Design a protein around this ligand. Structure first.
Ligand SMILES: C[As](C)(=O)[O-]
Ligand SMILES: [Cl-]
Lengths: 189, 189, 189
């Protein structure tokens, strides 16, 4: 069994990391972007079932909700699907301000790692990708926002997910992508 | 106290890492790009005050100076500001050629981690972001350049910065973004 | 001497890592992109000779070959060159489908780390970059593809590369960039 750390009330294994590709540092309100994100087993313990969670957070306003953006994704080689608003955590409000909306992006990966019983085990060195399509509705903006990739794992076969709407009873290392939702930079020269 | 390694006579804690988002691999001279960069406490020691440093480096020429580019930044949810040329290191000249221009991008983060006395403590798992607007003047080019993100920390409360013009008496893990400054690639097909 | 783990019968040192800059999450068939990728020594053991390997992989088809894309690269401040198809591994076919084409992108870096004898030693904290130009021929597509950065090292000076066509008898930590080859996302709103 692997070593867990505690963060808030949850168990975190830093050996399950996540990487982003193609997140722009500025997103235009109303426009659709596609990026990729994948979590990888940098440890020696094979997890029996895994799935990605994504957290969308605005630091400078607290009114953003799941319905304020459109979110589609595809697990590795499987087909695209719309992210399910019922597979989300309720909005969380940090003590310093803002709001984050955590979304579950789990499911079979097209027969690369996934098994007939539906699990997506993560042997060492292996990875699972979500290709993600994201768009924020027009008229909403943020000057310091981010996406966090939160890998979710089931520690033992037949474990239950611990956060309502998210995948996993233990979690991997949070990965960040900071951006602004608004207008691009004016010329400095 | 955390474990430091010595590198070029400075104290480095590899548990304070940095990530880049949105850096292009080719930058057009004269054009403004915006990217984000953030440092994260991946260790268990909470630093009492922290700030980011950025190094702009050209490997194939040594004539670049701070005056050859315009640089603005914004710490997390604080306001945009112009980077201060007096809050920069003197040009450094590696033995193999080229020049590094080390720039301090510190300050309050808009009250997320920062405190009324101006300090930015970095608890574990926490991060601080700089949104960065950058443009190199027209007529300057480089075929192998990069930005290095150098997190700076004050190890104990009331410590003084050790590199004149930069923030910190100890430093985090150097993170790199390599790019060309010049023209994009012609179509290979 | 460093600690190796075994992976598919090869020796891997996770302290030699790789990072990507500017890989887009969607690449258009026929269009040329340029990105950079660099491997960094995050350990304390200096390797006497190093070189990057790049793997192009399609998960959803197995007919892709080295001839189906154009690949040029440049080691740090050395000159651009075309990747040599004879310095490639034979196509590898995972049992679950798809194909991987592993390509050697080694050589001197313009005298930054490289020495007159042609070797590229990698001291601690140091790094080697490849600027990469990549284009897939028109009419070929993939819904889940990626680039893997496989650092190659020689553990000892008189060691020989262990995979025909790739650099190294030991290898670093695999780094991934997942993308689709095809059309960008249509508007969700
Ligand atoms: C209540 As609303 C403006 O977040 O859809
Ligand atoms: Cl956009």
């Amino acid at each position: 069994g692997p070593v867990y750390r505690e963060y808030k009330g949850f168990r975190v294994n830093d050996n399950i990391v996540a990487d982003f590709i193609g997140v722009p540092a500025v997103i235009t309100p109303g426009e659709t972007i596609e990026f990729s994100v994948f979590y990888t087993n940098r440890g020696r313990y094979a997890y029996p079932d895994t799935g990605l969670n994504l957290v969308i957070w605005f630091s400078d306003r607290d009114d953003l909700r799941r319905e304020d953006f459109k979110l589609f994704y595809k697990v590795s080689r499987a087909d695209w699907q719309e992210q399910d608003p019922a597979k989300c955590w309720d909005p969380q409000f940090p003590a310093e301000g803002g709001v984050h909306i955590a979304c579950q992006l789990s499911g079979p990966d097209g027969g690369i790692l996934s098994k007939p019983d539906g699990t997506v085990p993560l042997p060492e060195v292996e990875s699972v990708t979500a290709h993600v399509r994201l768009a924020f509705r027009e008229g909403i903006t943020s000057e310091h926002a981010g996406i966090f990739a939160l890998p979710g794992m089931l520690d033992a076969p037949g474990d239950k997910s611990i956060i309502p709407g998210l995948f996993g009873n233990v979690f991997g290392r949070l990965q960040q992508a900071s951006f602004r939702l608004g207008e691009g930079p004016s010329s400095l020269y």
